[PDB]
Amino acid sequence: APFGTLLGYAPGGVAIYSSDYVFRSYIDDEYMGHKWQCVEFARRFLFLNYGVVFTDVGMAWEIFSLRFLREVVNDNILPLQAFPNGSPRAPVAGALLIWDKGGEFKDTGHVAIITQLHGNKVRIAEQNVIHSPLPQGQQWTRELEMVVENGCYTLKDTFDDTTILGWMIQTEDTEYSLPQPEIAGELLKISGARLENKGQFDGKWLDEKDPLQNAYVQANGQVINQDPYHYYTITESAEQELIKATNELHLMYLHATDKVLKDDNLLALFDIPKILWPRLRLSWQRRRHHMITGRMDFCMDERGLKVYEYNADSASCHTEAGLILERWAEQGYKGNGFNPAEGLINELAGAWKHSRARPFVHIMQDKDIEENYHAQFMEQALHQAGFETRILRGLDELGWQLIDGEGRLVNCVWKTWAWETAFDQIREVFAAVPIRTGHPQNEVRLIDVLLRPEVLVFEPLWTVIPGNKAILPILWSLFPHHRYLLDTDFTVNDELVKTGYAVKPIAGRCGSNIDLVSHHEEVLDKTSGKFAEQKNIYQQLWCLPKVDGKYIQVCTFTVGGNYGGTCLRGDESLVIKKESDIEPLIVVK
Amino acid sequence: FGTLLGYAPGGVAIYSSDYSVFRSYIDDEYMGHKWQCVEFARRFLFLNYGVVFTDVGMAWEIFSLRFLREVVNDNILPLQAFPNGSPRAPVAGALLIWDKGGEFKDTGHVAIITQLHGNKVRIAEQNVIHSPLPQGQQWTRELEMVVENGCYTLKDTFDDTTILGWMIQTEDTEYSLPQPEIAGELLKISGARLENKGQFDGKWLDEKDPLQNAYVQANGQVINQDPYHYYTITESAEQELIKATNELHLMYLHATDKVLKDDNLLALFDIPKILWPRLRLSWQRRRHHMITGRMDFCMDERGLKVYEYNADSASCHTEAGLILERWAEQGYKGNGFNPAEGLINELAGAWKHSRARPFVHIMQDKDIEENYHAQFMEQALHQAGFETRILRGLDELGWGQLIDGEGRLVNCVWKTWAWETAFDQIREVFAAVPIRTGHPQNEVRLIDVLLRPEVLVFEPLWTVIPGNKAILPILWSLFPHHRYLLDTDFTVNDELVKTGYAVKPIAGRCGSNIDLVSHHEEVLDKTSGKFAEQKNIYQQLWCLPKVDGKYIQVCTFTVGGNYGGTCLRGDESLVIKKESDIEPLIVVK
Ligand SMILES: C[C@@H](NC(=O)CC[C@@H](N)C(=O)O)C(=O)NC[P@@](=O)(CCCCNCCCCN)OP(=O)(O)O
Ligand SMILES: C[C@@H](NC(=O)CC[C@@H](N)C(=O)O)C(=O)NC[P@@](=O)(CCCCNCCCCN)OP(=O)(O)O
Numbered sequence A: 001a002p003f004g005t006l007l008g009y010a011p012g013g014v015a016i017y018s019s020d021y022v023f024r025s026y027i028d029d030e031y032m033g034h035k036w037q038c039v040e041f042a043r044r045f046l047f048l049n050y051g052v053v054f055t056d057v058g059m060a061w062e063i064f065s066l067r068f069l070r071e072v073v074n075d076n077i078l079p080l081q082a083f084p085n086g087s088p089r090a091p092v093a094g095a096l097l098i099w100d101k102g103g104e105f106k107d108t109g110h111v112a113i114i115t116q117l118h119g120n121k122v123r124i125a126e127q128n129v130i131h132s133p134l135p136q137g138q139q140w141t142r143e144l145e146m147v148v149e150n151g152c153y154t155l156k157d158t159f160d161d162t163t164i165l166g167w168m169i170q171t172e173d174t175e176y177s178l179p180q181p182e183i184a185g186e187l188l189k190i191s192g193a194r195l196e197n198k199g200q201f202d203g204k205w206l207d208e209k210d211p212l213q214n215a216y217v218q219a220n221g222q223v224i225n226q227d228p229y230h231y232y233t234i235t236e237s238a239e240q241e242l243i244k245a246t247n248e249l250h251l252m253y254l255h256a257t258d259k260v261l262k263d264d265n266l267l268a269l270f271d272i273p274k275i276l277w278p279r280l281r282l283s284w285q286r287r288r289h290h291m292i293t294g295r296m297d298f299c300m301d302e303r304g305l306k307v308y309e310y311n312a313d314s315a316s317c318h319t320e321a322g323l324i325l326e327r328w329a330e331q332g333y334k335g336n337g338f339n340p341a342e343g344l345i346n347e348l349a350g351a352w353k354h355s356r357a358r359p360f361v362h363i364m365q366d367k368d369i370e371e372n373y374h375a376q377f378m379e380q381a382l383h384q385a386g387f388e389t390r391i392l393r394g395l396d397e398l399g400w401q402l403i404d405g406e407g408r409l410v411n412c413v414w415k416t417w418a419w420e421t422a423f424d425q426i427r428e429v430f431a432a433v434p435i436r437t438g439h440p441q442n443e444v445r446l447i448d449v450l451l452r453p454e455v456l457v458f459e460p461l462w463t464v465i466p467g468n469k470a471i472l473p474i475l476w477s478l479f480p481h482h483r484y485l486l487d488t489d490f491t492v493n494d495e496l497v498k499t500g501y502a503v504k505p506i507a508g509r510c511g512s513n514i515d516l517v518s519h520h521e522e523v524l525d526k527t528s529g530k531f532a533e534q535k536n537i538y539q540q541l542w543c544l545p546k547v548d549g550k551y552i553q554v555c556t557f558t559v560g561g562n563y564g565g566t567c568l569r570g571d572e573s574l575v576i577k578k579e580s581d582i583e584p585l586i587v588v589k
Numbered sequence B: 001f002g003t004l005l006g007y008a009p010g011g012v013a014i015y016s017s018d019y020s021v022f023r024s025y026i027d028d029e030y031m032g033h034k035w036q037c038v039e040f041a042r043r044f045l046f047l048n049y050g051v052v053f054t055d056v057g058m059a060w061e062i063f064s065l066r067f068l069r070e071v072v073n074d075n076i077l078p079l080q081a082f083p084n085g086s087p088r089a090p091v092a093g094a095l096l097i098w099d100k101g102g103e104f105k106d107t108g109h110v111a112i113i114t115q116l117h118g119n120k121v122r123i124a125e126q127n128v129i130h131s132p133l134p135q136g137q138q139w140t141r142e143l144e145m146v147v148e149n150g151c152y153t154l155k156d157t158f159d160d161t162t163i164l165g166w167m168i169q170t171e172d173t174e175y176s177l178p179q180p181e182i183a184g185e186l187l188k189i190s191g192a193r194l195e196n197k198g199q200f201d202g203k204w205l206d207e208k209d210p211l212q213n214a215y216v217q218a219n220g221q222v223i224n225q226d227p228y229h230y231y232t233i234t235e236s237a238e239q240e241l242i243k244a245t246n247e248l249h250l251m252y253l254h255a256t257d258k259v260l261k262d263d264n265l266l267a268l269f270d271i272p273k274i275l276w277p278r279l280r281l282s283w284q285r286r287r288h289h290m291i292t293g294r295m296d297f298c299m300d301e302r303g304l305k306v307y308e309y310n311a312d313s314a315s316c317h318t319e320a321g322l323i324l325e326r327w328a329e330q331g332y333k334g335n336g337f338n339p340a341e342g343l344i345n346e347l348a349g350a351w352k353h354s355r356a357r358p359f360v361h362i363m364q365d366k367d368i369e370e371n372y373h374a375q376f377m378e379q380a381l382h383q384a385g386f387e388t389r390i391l392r393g394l395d396e397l398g399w400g401q402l403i404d405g406e407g408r409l410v411n412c413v414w415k416t417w418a419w420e421t422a423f424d425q426i427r428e429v430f431a432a433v434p435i436r437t438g439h440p441q442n443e444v445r446l447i448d449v450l451l452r453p454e455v456l457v458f459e460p461l462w463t464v465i466p467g468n469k470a471i472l473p474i475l476w477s478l479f480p481h482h483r484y485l486l487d488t489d490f491t492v493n494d495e496l497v498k499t500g501y502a503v504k505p506i507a508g509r510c511g512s513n514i515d516l517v518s519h520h521e522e523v524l525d526k527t528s529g530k531f532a533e534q535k536n537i538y539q540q541l542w543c544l545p546k547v548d549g550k551y552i553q554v555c556t557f558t559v560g561g562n563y564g565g566t567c568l569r570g571d572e573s574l575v576i577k578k579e580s581d582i583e584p585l586i587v588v589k
């Protein structure tokens, strides 16, 4: 039957459509999947019957690697066990059934729901196998021979060339289960590479006729890094691991955010003016699904994958990884590899299309030359998502009801401004946020725009919580010894003294005021900055890898909660800074 | 009217409420009626502290409240009151309430104190100033404050008004006022006879009106055993009933919220576990979709208690809001009025503001009482713009989507059916709720309609929780010794033993299987019924007052969450039942 046709329903009344090729599938504010993949059904089936969902994955077979589910009515995390086909643990109804990649399910693999288990077979329901109407009243798509020998169940797919990894059950009982996988550090190694010099970058290789590139040029010139003939490479396998860590960590971050907002004791550790708390919570409940983009900082090498911070509030690198590196590649790369961030612009237009952003968006940026091309890069994402924008450098063009230069109303704002800056205008100075709605010499401040009740702002005010480092000790707290985390505390405890630690201001950035100390209690590195007086967090030391004379760092972009790309920052020192360059990155298989 | 005059602190608009779609919301949260004083004071609180006060008749009533509702998690906070002249100073943000009289006649007034000084305080408010305000001035009026011997006293700018005091949201009660208790006698119910002039000797009910005809067809030209008799209540009591309705309602939602968050609690309602996941989703997305419910109280000089709250499926609306209208219209030449005369416009109201689809299928069981109940509601919907079609039974329903006898798709239904009855269809006989999406002979069950995902149902699922008596011990738990509650438990503890106690099925109705043990330990009354196997609750004995040879019970309606009327149920026994009559009620000032 055509694409979209209803072929039947699964237990509980869950529809199943034909996907024989508005493609996103949502059930309210929740993303289900592409239409009509085997994954969209599986996730919708769990959401509609159990009110739980599994993270976003590249391919179906990757679902067998997850070890947690998200409970949707409260952003809570649930434990999920995996089981090998042939396990003493029977494939109960409701469980997820996963196919690896191979045979009928080539690279993707496959996922299905076990609807009913019998004595010599089981029934499953799925969405991308059958494209024809199901027997009236049949709430299963296929039957699978199941053998039972010595308290061990083994399924036999109806295809002669496929492999069934097993099934997953949401329980705390780990008996019989598979330990969570872990990629061979060998595959996480960052490798140097060189292109053959033939002067592909000898001149103006970045188009200056294009307003966006030229904007970038006017801030950096025809340059990305020290030497444009040298790039770095990672394995498609490591990228997969980065997509996995990004999507997982984000939920852990939203989950931690949730817990902080519900406990004054925790909220008090962020050093945010109390007058704002009620506004933080409201932002949380109302703008919960509005964060458009963030960037994570990772240390990646054979030792594994670690996360330093999450730039949820405001984050750049987008122009670099998503535009210049695209032209760089088109200009000098002739290999089979690819730029892991080439889909950044479209990924952003997409999040905007689906955002509840008003028709006209005012883009507010401070007067910084980097913020200059960043703003224009975000403006092009919005114009693609079909929005209208005007950029505002500084506040001078603003005036009062808030209006801009050309007399237009300001009701929707995208800021490159950091929420912290607005928090200073409050710290410096009541029954409410002390904002002006009138002024003799028509002088508008920052807080006078971002905190005015009728202005729709991105990133939302709650993002300043997962964006503040005081969240790290909380992360550690909720997921002790999590494979991707580093021990973090608000003091230096015994366990940090042995390992060594990095001192970091809870609201800093660009590597300002950072102190690295080794187990030998020796200061490996220091930086200064304007955030010297803020509270600090102490996080287990874990130094960047050095490759080809530079310490490389891995960064992933979150777009609407999911991986949107990867990029590199590389510096002659152990600490990355606003200046640290963006090195070309190619992923290879 | 509607003109923007200025902004209170935080950037809170203030409009003119002159005169010569009147509801105000901020999302799905109701602020008040445009553009009254109360609407501002609530919107100011909602926007800056994320709290709001319960609905009230007049602004002067707010000074009686002793709690606020935190919106981001339906939690309840303490709100203390302080009389003008008080060691406790009138801080910023606090509510300032005027009693009724003088300038603020019957209503009284409400303002927000924006800033305290040494000899004055500034206050922001609505409906007192109807002229624009000076640029950037975030206050409306100043008031002389006379600090003497440690006591603060405010003087109004009007010479005939009275300031009650101010209200601080805190746990410290020192210097505060105790909760106002209504005088015993103002709560006595009283019989009154009309002058017999044959006003009720023929077809006094207009048989021309289809809605009334249907009611006649089920009861004839009758309401009670003698329509020349009625009861009356002081406007002071109705005051108390509107107050206890809106408060208990919030107490019930607060309790509901708690249950849905802790399995150990939810496990007490005996609902099929396969539905738990669905109850929680219902609660999170249909939180504001409840249209109507009815509360049962015991009222007399002893005070005001609450027996139960029929949130799921409740009736009596035809009787109180239509027949009794006709009644008064036919034999009442008095000053009083029917406390439930607006109900029908009240309901059409909630329906305008519901997210109900344009076409509504009304579902009812074959009962002669439900027959007119559903035509009374069908009329509330017609007055709200929707189209409908009554469906008696389940025969007119086909199938792979659910359609009606005329072919139309059923995806939005209003039911008179009890959610507990579908629950039985699950407890009769699975990876999901067992529902048919097809069947040979085309046989839709009740469960096959209410639990089909694409069908919009009112009342929404979560109502089965506050509509279940298992919640009574919870409320007692959250609000022990609340003035309107009764000690309820899941056993017969020490206290109930000595006070006497009512035994009742957690999911019953119409007085079925009710047992009444006195403190002398003797079965006062007892009834039979179908829910004898169900779990029970044990509620403190508090017998109906007996007036004019009848046991009277007070009932209040909740429409969209707030008071919507009042009616009486009278019986020869202490236990009201399905057939208990509706006794005419007139409210007197
Ligand atoms: C968004 C950035 N800037 C701001 O927020 C300025 C805010 C300030 N104008 C205000 O009003 O608070 C920012 O500092 N982000 C932190 P970031 O997301 C991205 C850092 C940018 C690195 N740019 C390198 C350009 C190299 C050109 N050759 O990352 P971290 O610093 O690691 O935190
Ligand atoms: C809505 C009513 N009925 C049902 O829900 C029956 C559902 C049934 N069709 C099903 O199969 O589930 C109901 O029982 N409500 C309980 P209620 O809300 C209203 C009782 C109605 C009293 N009518 C008196 C008419 C007198 C005419 N002279 O109140 P309580 O019984 O006190 O609980």
Ligand SMILES: Nc1ncnc2c1ncn2[C@@H]1O[C@H](COP(=O)(O)OP(=O)(O)O)[C@@H](O)[C@H]1O
Residues within 6 Å of the ligand: A297, A308, A309, A486, A501, A502, A504, A508, A509, A510, A511, A512, A514, A516, A539, A540, A541, A542, A543, A544, A553, A574, A575, A576, A577
């Ligand atoms: N625990 C740590 N161990 C080793 N290096 C660290 C650690 N924390 C931070 N760094 C280094 O410092 C840089 C900046 O710290 P980061 O935590 O990302 O904060 P910022 O927001 O200032 O960029 C990182 O890019 C990394 O090179």
Ligand SMILES: Nc1ncnc2c1ncn2[C@@H]1O[C@H](COP(=O)(O)OP(=O)(O)O)[C@@H](O)[C@H]1O
Residues within 6 Å of the ligand: B296, B307, B308, B486, B501, B502, B504, B508, B509, B510, B511, B512, B514, B516, B539, B540, B541, B542, B543, B544, B553, B574, B575, B576, B577
């Ligand atoms: N605690 C109690 N003390 C005395 N009478 C009670 C008590 N609870 C209920 N009753 C009597 O029993 C009737 C039925 O109880 P109710 O709680 O309303 O359940 P139902 O859903 O069956 O109407 C009431 O209307 C009232 O007359």
Ligand SMILES: [Mg+2]
Residues within 6 Å of the ligand: A297, A308, A309, A510, A511, A576
């Ligand atoms: Mg960093």
Ligand SMILES: [Mg+2]
Residues within 6 Å of the ligand: A309, A310, A311, A508, A509, A510
């Ligand atoms: Mg940062």
Ligand SMILES: [Mg+2]
Residues within 6 Å of the ligand: B296, B308, B510, B511, B576
């Ligand atoms: Mg009752």
Ligand SMILES: [Mg+2]
Residues within 6 Å of the ligand: B308, B310, B508, B509, B510
């Ligand atoms: Mg009842």
